């Protein structure tokens, strides 16, 4: 399945005024389901970092960043999440994926599964494609083997939806109720 998060580059600034005739222009990296959430995250970051509110600023661009050609790569994702008891916890993880958006979506799913963290309590600090020899975790390093192979065992193979049946003869493919 394609990733549920998209790579957005949000470029914006504060609205020029008499105190600030030439405001600084900020570029922002976000992974969001849509550009509305992308702009919301951009303005949250501008408010909590540069003391600029969305009501006193404007957005020069909210474009998407196209993914590179699909290649099996190792992606280092530096990410952070908030919990009430633990405060802010920052971690760095390695993922095997074909795209930056895919790796970041995998990271979001992993954080939700293992730490019960939702999208709005997670800040992605960085995502980058690292070489094979810089991978630290063995769970990711095990896919660097030049001759890597394995059989598919314990596979629940379902029939095509048009050919699925309720009652099938015991040792034949004949369907009794379908």
């Amino acid at each position: 399945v394609k990733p549920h998060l998209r790579h957005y580059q949000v470029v914006g600034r504060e609205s020029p005024s008499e105190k600030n005739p030439e405001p600084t222009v900020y570029k922002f990296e976000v992974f969001a389901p849509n550009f509305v959430v992308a702009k919301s995250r951009f303005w949250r970051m501008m408010r909590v970092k540069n003391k600029v509110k969305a009501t006193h600023g404007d957005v020069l661009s909210c474009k998407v960043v196209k993914d590179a050609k699909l290649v099996a790569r190792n992606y280092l994702v530096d990410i952070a999440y908030y919990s009430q008891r633990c405060g802010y916890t920052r971690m760095v993880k390695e993922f095997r994926d074909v795209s930056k958006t895919g790796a970041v979506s995998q990271a979001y799913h992993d954080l939700a599964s293992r730490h019960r963290a939702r999208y709005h309590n997670i800040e992605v600090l960085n995502v980058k494609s690292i070489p094979d020899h810089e991978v630290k975790h063995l769970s990711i390093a095990q896919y660097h083997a030049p001759n890597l192979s394995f059989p598919l065992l314990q596979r629940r193979t379902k029939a095509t939806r048009k050919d699925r049946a309720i009652f099938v003869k015991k040792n034949t493919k004949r369907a009794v109720v379908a």
Binding site: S15, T24, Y26, K27, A80, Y88
Partner: protein, 158 residues
């Protein structure tokens, strides 16, 4: 328990500000109040003679009668399903001239001046343009907005 006298619950209301104590000044005495004027009724705690009730502190109205040492003001007060026009009598030290119609009077005078200029043929001032229009932005410096590792350490005390 709680009583219901004329000056109940006015400990911070009828109190002078910090390092602003004192009886009213000469410019308060020399101010001219006319019938039909708008005035704010702010009680001066140092006078204590002719002070309004605690309700009328901060309300503005139109003076309806002028008296040697007093002023009568018509203040709107909502009771139940309607607002009454209560005519309160205070001393002149507890009223200030109101600037509520300042912008309206300035707008009227600006319109008259503009009409005079148009009649005389003088060039009118340039019209303002909205800041909500589009345009090409040439940035002096472009920065990267991102969350860094040091931010969490900075926000974490001790």
């Amino acid at each position: 328990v709680h009583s219901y006298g004329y000056k109940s619950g006015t400990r911070h209301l009828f109190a002078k500000k910090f390092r602003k104590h004192g009886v009213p000044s000469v410019s308060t005495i020399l101010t001219n109040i006319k019938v039909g004027d708008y005035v704010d009724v702010v009680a001066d705690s140092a006078v204590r003679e002719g002070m309004p009730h605690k309700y009328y502190h901060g309300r503005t109205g139109i003076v309806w009668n002028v008296t040697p040492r007093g002023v009568g003001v018509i203040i709107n007060k909502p009771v139940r399903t309607r607002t009454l026009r209560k005519r309160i009598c205070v001393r002149f030290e507890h009223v200030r001239k109101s600037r509520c119609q300042e912008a309206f009077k300035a707008k009227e005078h600006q319109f008259q001046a503009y009409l005079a200029a148009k009649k005389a043929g003088k060039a009118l001032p340039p019209l303002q343009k909205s800041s909500r229009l589009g345009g090409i932005v040439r940035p002096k410096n472009v920065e990267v907005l991102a969350r860094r590792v040091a931010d969490y350490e900075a926000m974490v005390p001790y």
